[PDB]
Amino acid sequence: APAPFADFAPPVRPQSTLRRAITAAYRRPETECLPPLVEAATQSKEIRDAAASTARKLIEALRGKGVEGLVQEYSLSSQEGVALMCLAEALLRIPDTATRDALIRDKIADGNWRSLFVNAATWGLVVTGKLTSTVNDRSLAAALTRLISRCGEPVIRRGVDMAMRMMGEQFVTGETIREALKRSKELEEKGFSYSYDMLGEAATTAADAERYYRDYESAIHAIGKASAGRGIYEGPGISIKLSALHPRYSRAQAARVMGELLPRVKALALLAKNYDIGLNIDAEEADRLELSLDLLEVLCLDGDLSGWNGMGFVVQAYGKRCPFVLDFIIDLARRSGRRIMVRLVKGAYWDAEIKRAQLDGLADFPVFTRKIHTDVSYIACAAKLLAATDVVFPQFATHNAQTLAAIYHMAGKDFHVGKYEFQCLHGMGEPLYEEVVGRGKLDRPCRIYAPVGTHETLLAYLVRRLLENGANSSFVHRINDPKVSIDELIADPVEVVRAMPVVGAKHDRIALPAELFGDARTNSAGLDLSNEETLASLTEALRESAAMKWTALPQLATGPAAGETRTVLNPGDHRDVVGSVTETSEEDARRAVRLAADAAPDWAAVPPSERAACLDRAAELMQARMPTLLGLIIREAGKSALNAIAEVREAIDFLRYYAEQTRRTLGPGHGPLGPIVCISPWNFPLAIFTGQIAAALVAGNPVLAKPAEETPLIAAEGVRILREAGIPASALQLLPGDGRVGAALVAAAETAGVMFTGSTEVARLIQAQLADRLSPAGRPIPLIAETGGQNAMIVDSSALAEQVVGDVITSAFDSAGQRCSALRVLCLQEDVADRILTMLKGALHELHIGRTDRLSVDVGPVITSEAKDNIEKHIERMRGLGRKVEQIGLASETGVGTFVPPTIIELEKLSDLQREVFGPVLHVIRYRRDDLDRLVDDVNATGYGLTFGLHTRLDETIAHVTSRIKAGNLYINRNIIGAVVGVQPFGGRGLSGTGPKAGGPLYLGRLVTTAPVPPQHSSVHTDPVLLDFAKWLDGKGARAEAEAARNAGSSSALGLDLELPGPVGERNLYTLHARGRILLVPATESGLYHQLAAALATGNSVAIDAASGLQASLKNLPQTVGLRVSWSKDWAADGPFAGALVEGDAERIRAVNKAIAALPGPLLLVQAASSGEIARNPDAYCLNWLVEEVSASINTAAAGGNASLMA
Ligand SMILES: Cc1cc2nc3c(=O)[nH]c(=O)nc-3n(C[C@H](O)[C@H](O)[C@H](O)COP(=O)(O)OP(=O)(O)OC[C@H]3O[C@@H](n4cnc5c(N)ncnc54)[C@H](O)[C@@H]3O)c2cc1C
Ligand SMILES: NC(=O)c1ccc[n+]([C@@H]2O[C@H](COP(=O)([O-])OP(=O)(O)OC[C@H]3O[C@@H](n4cnc5c(N)ncnc54)[C@H](O)[C@@H]3O)[C@@H](O)[C@H]2O)c1
Ligand SMILES: O=C(O)[C@@H]1CCCO1
Ligand SMILES: [Mg+2]
């Protein structure tokens, strides 16, 4: 049995002094990076003046020398131009040129012309220079009809010829490498050279990686044949992306990268060596930089590649590590004797790096945040390169004439071909470099980066270009802006930075990850698993955590209690004993509730701000102890390191969010319920456990904490931390054990409320036990019950398959599918289903399943043998019905634990599924586009309503689907497992939950006897049926009830529509809707009128108990109100309901509550009042619990860029 964490994340090699200097700079504060760059980039006054003259001369030449002309000639609006180019693109997909021309002439031009507008975001950038994440396809369809009806065939022909020029000649150098080489003759004769890129990146499967390899290999042959001995400086070369060549290119898979990716790069390099051409490794995301250095090191030390100086490597000047990376590379060049070709660039992934660091809660960004800082960094790094031209070959890639001029003069008057060169991108830099290359200009060579491929393979690269072209900060954008003077364009960034008040200050309008929520609270901090210092320190902390004697005991107010004790075994290896749990006797569970009741007044008397300070102190302790907490979660609950970071971060965020919500709301009149029983699931064993307890405690209630029997150790540590933070032992008691302990707690006489997260079936048993119970005030015991899901994602033919597959693999198989939010049913539009399914199965087989104490493990075990047996029986039944089943093969080492292999099951109908299957099992169905609305019905028809995902680029489809789906958490163009506290308030409806949402603003109000007004909780909307009903009441003479109705209409927050603060590149929305049909059980006419006002003011329909005998009280209702009202004799026949309102004395409420609990389907949030309370208290029925919260998270970077960060 291997020692825990002894092989967690060993580095590829021992980190040298130079490598450690790189890692030290990874996220260094921007004010510390800039001063040495300013000093390195400083040049003499004479050179600065000379460079400004050269830059002015270049810019004047640029400004002094076809889509806009098409827009002008045919008077096209912006949308008409975009729509026309989408049509032209689609027409060009027809190969037979006469067949296309006849479709144009006879069918398109004459009238009624996969959505035509799938790529409109790209054409929008071409036409308008602005980026939209999604496409208004109804606007584009109207615009195309208008322009064709106005201008006919001529405008279509002009669009086709314009698209053909841009797509065949401007976006790519050629469709094939042979085409690109033939077209390179012209500029090679004028002094340019080329580096060809077979478009391709981010391989999803082994098959994709092999396709990109053979693309590269065939291009090396063609380029080498064409080079015909010109060598690495005067002849052409190739550029490659490491992410194209392996589907798991990441630090977490470093062993596979060195064992599988490295030999592939070596084979390509050997072929480049034989032809003597350059082979450049492009630079990609920040978390791949240092990994790529390990490949560079091995290749440059490999004797089989000796004699060849064509190996090249990009370094990104927008990165904080750039000068230290250059020190490492220059030293490697000296050690190896290879003259490494070093392409200095600014960087292509800036928007994505900002979003990623914010999402991961890291200490700082790995890139600069002011564009001028990247400019200074570039010039400083150029000075370093120009001092080492004997050992490296610098390649200065830039379109910025000021940057170019600065380097041209920095390099001085001595030049020979091979000393250094400039570089530019095809279709962007030729105007500038035609003023540079050649004896009549500056006589310096330029290498053109030449993309090669078809329109399909071109998307991602193209959008990075178009964003670059349209960004306000870009030289190529500003050169075209008439409001930008030449003097502004030649301003020296080095001197501009030197003169700023704080050299290197972070951008004013970009939040550090810790500051995403501003003054409200501090964001939880994560850990960078790509940082070698972090991995080394985490390895030691994880090993030390495995040496600790973790225990969980019954912790009563009076001290620990005795009980039956057993070991807790690692689910991924039952030989690894994690700790010991002593479980609670049912006698002691009852004693704990009595002690809680006795301690309730003392805890309620602690003022809310001091209760909140306890939560904040506990969050600080959890943040500080995160490495140790990670180790426990990994071993007790089968979580990977990434899963466990997210778990601890979530717990910190609950603590701080409920603390701040308390400070915003709770006062003396918001009295506590009393002892609250908190029952929690195994699968989020710290986060959900902490959240329920923290909310109940901070609302002034003493808590009985009953963790899942599977995961008591991390729960005990959470309680220990909360007690250390100041929660008195009498206010927070830990009762480990199984469902018998939970049931004994729920049944205890002094239990004043229950917070339950777990399976729907268990929630239903708790509902049943509470149905016969009333508070001393004669009201129902509040239950929050957050339950299972049957979560779907719908994917149409406009989605990007590579994005879909990544979000599907994560959503379905993260934590072995043991997330309540996990993707259970993937719904694929029929026309793209085969291609996406094939990619999904390929991605499935790249997952590593095993004991989770290794960074390389993607998917861990299931929690118990019973869970495994339950999941496997579902798979084998599906297999026995004839469904296609795909499964990863598991390594023999999984035999010591309880593992289920990630599984894909292809279903015929969505009704093939009954209940939630809580494991790594993805079901797939296909649909025809015209049946989309029916499909949404089928998804709704399960009765669940937790998470839901949609991948589409089409606004019409977003508006349709999101308006019809009934789920609590929606996700657009991203994974569906997001639950960031206060950003995606989390919780569903129907079989998935009663509400209110955890991590949302209505939560604390359920835990007090009088709910406060939540922050931002109001709406100016008034339900119109409520208004009609209030007028009807006035017509009937019920003046007091009509006034109460109007007041309910105003007080309702139905229609609240908020955007919540969060990371860039995301919109996170929070809205309040009707719940659905509310069951009304009135006793009196006036009670009925008040119940109906409450339900209508919150947008609901109603079913009214016919046994009330109150039918004569609703004579001659307006039709608008009548449409919302039904009478029910058999309640169980007319559901499902979404809540209930009850009127009566205590025994009537008890009897009705029992009848309601017996209704099939969802747990109902029931509110009860006596006739007298309805008369006395306008809030007898609380409108908070008659609306439904919906959270929607939209990935606005999904088109490949961030429009907000463009401006
Ligand atoms: C031949 C060639 C090859 C290239 N290869 C790669 C590569 O392998 N990997 C890669 O990542 N890039 C690469 N690039 C760079 C990238 O694709 C862009 O072309 C380049 O960053 C634009 O820089 P510039 O000097 O032309 O223009 P500029 O207008 O001078 O500079 C724009 C750049 O500033 C940076 N920037 C913008 N806003 C901010 C901000 N708020 N804070 C900090 N920085 C900011 C970005 O890097 C942006 O691209 C390459 C460029 C060329 C010409
Ligand atoms: N809606 C959400 O936010 C959410 C979040 C996480 C998990 N879940 C759901 O949780 C489930 C998985 O967690 P689980 O397997 O630990 O759930 P579970 O229903 O098996 O157990 C949950 C808790 O209830 C206790 N319990 C069992 N029987 C009881 C009884 N008769 N009376 C009182 N308490 C009893 C258990 O001991 C445990 O602490 C899944 O169905 C998942 O979808 C929902
Ligand atoms: O892929 C990109 O966008 C950059 C530019 C060229 C290579 O790396
Ligand atoms: Mg269970």
Tab-separated table of N, CA and C in Angstrom, residues 352-451:
chain	number	residue	atom	x	y	z
A	352	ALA	N	-8.263	36.107	-21.448
A	352	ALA	CA	-8.477	34.808	-20.819
A	352	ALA	C	-7.658	34.670	-19.541
A	353	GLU	N	-6.454	35.239	-19.513
A	353	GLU	CA	-5.645	35.156	-18.303
A	353	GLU	C	-6.273	35.955	-17.178
A	354	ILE	N	-6.889	37.100	-17.497
A	354	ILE	CA	-7.538	37.896	-16.452
A	354	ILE	C	-8.694	37.111	-15.843
A	355	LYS	N	-9.552	36.552	-16.694
A	355	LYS	CA	-10.687	35.789	-16.194
A	355	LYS	C	-10.228	34.581	-15.393
A	356	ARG	N	-9.206	33.871	-15.881
A	356	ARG	CA	-8.810	32.624	-15.227
A	356	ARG	C	-8.309	32.879	-13.806
A	357	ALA	N	-7.483	33.916	-13.623
A	357	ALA	CA	-6.952	34.215	-12.296
A	357	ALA	C	-8.060	34.626	-11.347
A	358	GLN	N	-9.082	35.308	-11.860
A	358	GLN	CA	-10.185	35.711	-10.993
A	358	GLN	C	-11.001	34.500	-10.579
A	359	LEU	N	-11.344	33.639	-11.549
A	359	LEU	CA	-12.067	32.408	-11.251
A	359	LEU	C	-11.324	31.551	-10.230
A	360	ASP	N	-9.995	31.425	-10.361
A	360	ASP	CA	-9.265	30.525	-9.469
A	360	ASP	C	-8.889	31.160	-8.133
A	361	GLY	N	-9.238	32.426	-7.910
A	361	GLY	CA	-8.925	33.108	-6.654
A	361	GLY	C	-7.444	33.187	-6.349
A	362	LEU	N	-6.621	33.458	-7.360
A	362	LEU	CA	-5.188	33.403	-7.114
A	362	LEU	C	-4.668	34.764	-6.670
A	363	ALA	N	-3.393	34.790	-6.255
A	363	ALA	CA	-2.880	35.961	-5.553
A	363	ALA	C	-2.814	37.190	-6.458
A	364	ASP	N	-2.547	36.992	-7.743
A	364	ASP	CA	-2.383	38.098	-8.680
A	364	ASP	C	-2.471	37.528	-10.089
A	365	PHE	N	-2.313	38.405	-11.101
A	365	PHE	CA	-2.348	37.910	-12.469
A	365	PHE	C	-0.956	37.495	-12.911
A	366	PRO	N	-0.867	36.585	-13.876
A	366	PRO	CA	0.440	36.222	-14.442
A	366	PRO	C	0.832	37.100	-15.620
A	367	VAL	N	0.003	38.095	-15.928
A	367	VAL	CA	0.245	39.060	-16.989
A	367	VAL	C	0.071	40.453	-16.403
A	368	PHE	N	0.614	41.443	-17.102
A	368	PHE	CA	0.367	42.829	-16.724
A	368	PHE	C	-1.093	43.189	-16.987
A	369	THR	N	-1.530	44.291	-16.373
A	369	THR	CA	-2.903	44.753	-16.505
A	369	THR	C	-3.015	46.118	-17.156
A	370	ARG	N	-1.914	46.845	-17.315
A	370	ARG	CA	-1.874	48.048	-18.136
A	370	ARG	C	-1.098	47.754	-19.412
A	371	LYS	N	-1.688	48.114	-20.556
A	371	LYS	CA	-1.055	47.793	-21.835
A	371	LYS	C	0.342	48.405	-21.935
A	372	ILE	N	0.531	49.606	-21.379
A	372	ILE	CA	1.839	50.240	-21.474
A	372	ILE	C	2.896	49.450	-20.701
A	373	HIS	N	2.498	48.708	-19.665
A	373	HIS	CA	3.452	47.856	-18.959
A	373	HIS	C	3.979	46.748	-19.859
A	374	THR	N	3.093	46.130	-20.645
A	374	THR	CA	3.543	45.145	-21.621
A	374	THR	C	4.517	45.767	-22.627
A	375	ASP	N	4.287	47.030	-23.018
A	375	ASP	CA	5.210	47.675	-23.957
A	375	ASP	C	6.592	47.857	-23.347
A	376	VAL	N	6.658	48.321	-22.097
A	376	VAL	CA	7.954	48.485	-21.439
A	376	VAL	C	8.640	47.136	-21.266
A	377	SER	N	7.885	46.125	-20.822
A	377	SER	CA	8.435	44.774	-20.679
A	377	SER	C	9.038	44.280	-21.989
A	378	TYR	N	8.325	44.483	-23.103
A	378	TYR	CA	8.842	44.077	-24.406
A	378	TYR	C	10.192	44.722	-24.700
A	379	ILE	N	10.287	46.040	-24.508
A	379	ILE	CA	11.502	46.755	-24.874
A	379	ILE	C	12.655	46.360	-23.958
A	380	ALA	N	12.365	46.151	-22.670
A	380	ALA	CA	13.382	45.675	-21.732
A	380	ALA	C	13.897	44.303	-22.117
A	381	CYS	N	12.997	43.411	-22.525
A	381	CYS	CA	13.414	42.071	-22.910
A	381	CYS	C	14.142	42.084	-24.241
A	382	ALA	N	13.817	43.035	-25.125
A	382	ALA	CA	14.580	43.158	-26.361
A	382	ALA	C	16.022	43.560	-26.080
A	383	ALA	N	16.230	44.439	-25.101
A	383	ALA	CA	17.590	44.825	-24.739
A	383	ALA	C	18.385	43.613	-24.268
A	384	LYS	N	17.735	42.722	-23.509
A	384	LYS	CA	18.403	41.513	-23.046
A	384	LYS	C	18.775	40.620	-24.220
A	385	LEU	N	17.853	40.450	-25.177
A	385	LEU	CA	18.111	39.601	-26.339
A	385	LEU	C	19.218	40.165	-27.226
A	386	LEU	N	19.244	41.482	-27.407
A	386	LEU	CA	20.212	42.075	-28.320
A	386	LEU	C	21.623	42.027	-27.766
A	387	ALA	N	21.771	41.814	-26.455
A	387	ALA	CA	23.059	41.577	-25.819
A	387	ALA	C	23.552	40.146	-25.987
A	388	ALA	N	22.721	39.243	-26.520
A	388	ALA	CA	23.063	37.829	-26.587
A	388	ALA	C	22.877	37.273	-27.993
A	389	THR	N	23.044	38.111	-29.029
A	389	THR	CA	22.876	37.619	-30.394
A	389	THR	C	23.946	36.615	-30.802
A	390	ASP	N	25.045	36.481	-30.044
A	390	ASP	CA	25.970	35.401	-30.362
A	390	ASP	C	25.423	34.034	-29.964
A	391	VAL	N	24.505	33.956	-28.998
A	391	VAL	CA	24.031	32.662	-28.534
A	391	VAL	C	22.556	32.397	-28.816
A	392	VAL	N	21.737	33.423	-29.070
A	392	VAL	CA	20.358	33.211	-29.503
A	392	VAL	C	20.105	34.080	-30.725
A	393	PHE	N	19.038	33.747	-31.446
A	393	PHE	CA	18.615	34.516	-32.610
A	393	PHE	C	17.311	35.224	-32.273
A	394	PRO	N	17.336	36.526	-31.957
A	394	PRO	CA	16.093	37.214	-31.571
A	394	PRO	C	15.204	37.483	-32.771
A	395	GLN	N	13.898	37.319	-32.551
A	395	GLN	CA	12.872	37.513	-33.570
A	395	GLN	C	11.827	38.426	-32.954
A	396	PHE	N	11.761	39.674	-33.414
A	396	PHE	CA	10.931	40.684	-32.759
A	396	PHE	C	9.600	40.773	-33.489
A	397	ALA	N	8.584	40.153	-32.898
A	397	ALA	CA	7.265	40.063	-33.502
A	397	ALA	C	6.429	41.224	-32.989
A	398	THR	N	6.045	42.132	-33.883
A	398	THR	CA	5.213	43.254	-33.459
A	398	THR	C	4.681	43.983	-34.686
A	399	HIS	N	3.477	44.543	-34.540
A	399	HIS	CA	2.895	45.424	-35.542
A	399	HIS	C	2.946	46.885	-35.134
A	400	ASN	N	3.532	47.183	-33.984
A	400	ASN	CA	3.532	48.522	-33.412
A	400	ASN	C	4.761	49.269	-33.918
A	401	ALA	N	4.542	50.355	-34.667
A	401	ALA	CA	5.651	51.061	-35.299
A	401	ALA	C	6.565	51.724	-34.275
A	402	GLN	N	6.019	52.117	-33.118
A	402	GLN	CA	6.850	52.712	-32.074
A	402	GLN	C	7.754	51.661	-31.450
A	403	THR	N	7.187	50.481	-31.140
A	403	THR	CA	7.981	49.355	-30.642
A	403	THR	C	9.089	49.002	-31.625
A	404	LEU	N	8.736	48.884	-32.907
A	404	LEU	CA	9.713	48.559	-33.939
A	404	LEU	C	10.838	49.588	-33.988
A	405	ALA	N	10.479	50.879	-34.037
A	405	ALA	CA	11.490	51.932	-34.112
A	405	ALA	C	12.440	51.870	-32.921
A	406	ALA	N	11.889	51.666	-31.721
A	406	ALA	CA	12.718	51.590	-30.523
A	406	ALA	C	13.754	50.481	-30.641
A	407	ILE	N	13.367	49.347	-31.215
A	407	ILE	CA	14.271	48.207	-31.309
A	407	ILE	C	15.258	48.384	-32.454
A	408	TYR	N	14.791	48.907	-33.590
A	408	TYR	CA	15.673	49.193	-34.718
A	408	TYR	C	16.844	50.070	-34.298
A	409	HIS	N	16.570	51.104	-33.516
A	409	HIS	CA	17.647	51.975	-33.065
A	409	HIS	C	18.425	51.369	-31.904
A	410	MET	N	17.764	50.581	-31.054
A	410	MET	CA	18.484	49.858	-30.012
A	410	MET	C	19.509	48.907	-30.610
A	411	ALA	N	19.176	48.280	-31.744
A	411	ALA	CA	20.060	47.286	-32.339
A	411	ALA	C	21.287	47.915	-32.984
A	412	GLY	N	21.203	49.180	-33.385
A	412	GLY	CA	22.357	49.879	-33.906
A	412	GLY	C	22.597	49.571	-35.367
A	413	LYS	N	23.738	50.069	-35.854
A	413	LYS	CA	24.014	50.113	-37.282
A	413	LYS	C	24.646	48.844	-37.829
A	414	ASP	N	25.213	47.992	-36.981
A	414	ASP	CA	25.792	46.744	-37.456
A	414	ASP	C	24.689	45.709	-37.609
A	415	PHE	N	24.534	45.186	-38.820
A	415	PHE	CA	23.527	44.165	-39.053
A	415	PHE	C	24.014	43.203	-40.126
A	416	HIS	N	23.633	41.940	-39.971
A	416	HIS	CA	23.795	40.943	-41.010
A	416	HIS	C	22.605	40.007	-40.912
A	417	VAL	N	22.242	39.395	-42.036
A	417	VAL	CA	21.159	38.422	-41.992
A	417	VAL	C	21.589	37.266	-41.106
A	418	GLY	N	20.709	36.872	-40.177
A	418	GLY	CA	21.049	35.948	-39.117
A	418	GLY	C	21.329	36.585	-37.764
A	419	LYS	N	21.513	37.908	-37.693
A	419	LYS	CA	21.737	38.538	-36.394
A	419	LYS	C	20.452	38.590	-35.584
A	420	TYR	N	19.400	39.125	-36.184
A	420	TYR	CA	18.046	39.101	-35.648
A	420	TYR	C	17.103	39.355	-36.821
A	421	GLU	N	15.806	39.279	-36.557
A	421	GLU	CA	14.830	39.640	-37.574
A	421	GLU	C	13.611	40.217	-36.878
A	422	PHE	N	12.748	40.840	-37.662
A	422	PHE	CA	11.406	41.164	-37.198
A	422	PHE	C	10.424	40.097	-37.675
A	423	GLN	N	9.221	40.103	-37.078
A	423	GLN	CA	8.155	39.208	-37.517
A	423	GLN	C	6.810	39.911	-37.476
A	424	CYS	N	5.891	39.417	-38.311
A	424	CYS	CA	4.533	39.945	-38.333
A	424	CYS	C	3.565	38.835	-38.719
A	425	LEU	N	2.281	39.112	-38.516
A	425	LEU	CA	1.228	38.166	-38.861
A	425	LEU	C	0.714	38.449	-40.269
A	426	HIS	N	0.461	37.382	-41.026
A	426	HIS	CA	-0.092	37.522	-42.366
A	426	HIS	C	-1.377	38.341	-42.313
A	427	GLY	N	-1.527	39.254	-43.266
A	427	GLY	CA	-2.730	40.065	-43.320
A	427	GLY	C	-2.833	41.159	-42.283
A	428	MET	N	-1.808	41.369	-41.472
A	428	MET	CA	-1.830	42.467	-40.515
A	428	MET	C	-0.598	43.343	-40.618
A	429	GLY	N	0.574	42.760	-40.864
A	429	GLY	CA	1.789	43.528	-40.736
A	429	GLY	C	2.483	43.925	-42.023
A	430	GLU	N	1.986	43.473	-43.164
A	430	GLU	CA	2.680	43.788	-44.408
A	430	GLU	C	2.721	45.278	-44.723
A	431	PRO	N	1.672	46.072	-44.481
A	431	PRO	CA	1.805	47.520	-44.729
A	431	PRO	C	2.961	48.136	-43.963
A	432	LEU	N	3.119	47.772	-42.692
A	432	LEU	CA	4.235	48.289	-41.907
A	432	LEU	C	5.569	47.780	-42.435
A	433	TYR	N	5.674	46.478	-42.690
A	433	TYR	CA	6.989	45.948	-43.000
A	433	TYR	C	7.391	46.153	-44.451
A	434	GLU	N	6.462	46.521	-45.328
A	434	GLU	CA	6.894	47.048	-46.618
A	434	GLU	C	7.618	48.385	-46.488
A	435	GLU	N	7.518	49.051	-45.343
A	435	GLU	CA	8.321	50.232	-45.053
A	435	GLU	C	9.618	49.894	-44.327
A	436	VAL	N	9.911	48.604	-44.138
A	436	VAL	CA	11.048	48.143	-43.349
A	436	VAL	C	11.988	47.277	-44.177
A	437	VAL	N	11.449	46.231	-44.810
A	437	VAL	CA	12.276	45.281	-45.549
A	437	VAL	C	12.849	45.936	-46.800
A	438	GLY	N	14.094	45.618	-47.112
A	438	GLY	CA	14.645	46.026	-48.389
A	438	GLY	C	15.652	47.156	-48.256
A	439	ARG	N	16.594	47.200	-49.210
A	439	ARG	CA	17.711	48.135	-49.126
A	439	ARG	C	17.248	49.585	-49.210
A	440	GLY	N	16.120	49.839	-49.860
A	440	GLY	CA	15.564	51.174	-49.925
A	440	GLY	C	14.725	51.582	-48.740
A	441	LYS	N	14.557	50.705	-47.752
A	441	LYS	CA	13.803	51.070	-46.559
A	441	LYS	C	14.739	51.057	-45.357
A	442	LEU	N	14.458	50.222	-44.359
A	442	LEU	CA	15.362	50.069	-43.227
A	442	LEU	C	16.327	48.897	-43.392
A	443	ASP	N	16.127	48.060	-44.415
A	443	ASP	CA	17.008	46.930	-44.728
A	443	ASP	C	17.114	45.968	-43.550
A	444	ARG	N	15.962	45.618	-42.997
A	444	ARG	CA	15.884	44.614	-41.956
A	444	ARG	C	14.842	43.592	-42.374
A	445	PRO	N	15.112	42.311	-42.181
A	445	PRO	CA	14.192	41.275	-42.653
A	445	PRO	C	13.011	41.082	-41.720
A	446	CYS	N	11.932	40.559	-42.305
A	446	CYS	CA	10.706	40.266	-41.579
A	446	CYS	C	10.207	38.888	-41.976
A	447	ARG	N	9.863	38.084	-40.978
A	447	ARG	CA	9.263	36.774	-41.188
A	447	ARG	C	7.767	36.871	-40.929
A	448	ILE	N	6.983	36.439	-41.902
A	448	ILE	CA	5.532	36.472	-41.821
A	448	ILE	C	5.030	35.163	-41.247
A	449	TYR	N	4.240	35.255	-40.174
A	449	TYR	CA	3.554	34.104	-39.598
A	449	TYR	C	2.315	33.812	-40.438
A	450	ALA	N	2.291	32.646	-41.076
A	450	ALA	CA	1.348	32.351	-42.156
A	450	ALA	C	0.399	31.232	-41.756
A	451	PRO	N	-0.837	31.551	-41.380
A	451	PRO	CA	-1.790	30.492	-41.052
A	451	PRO	C	-2.249	29.787	-42.320
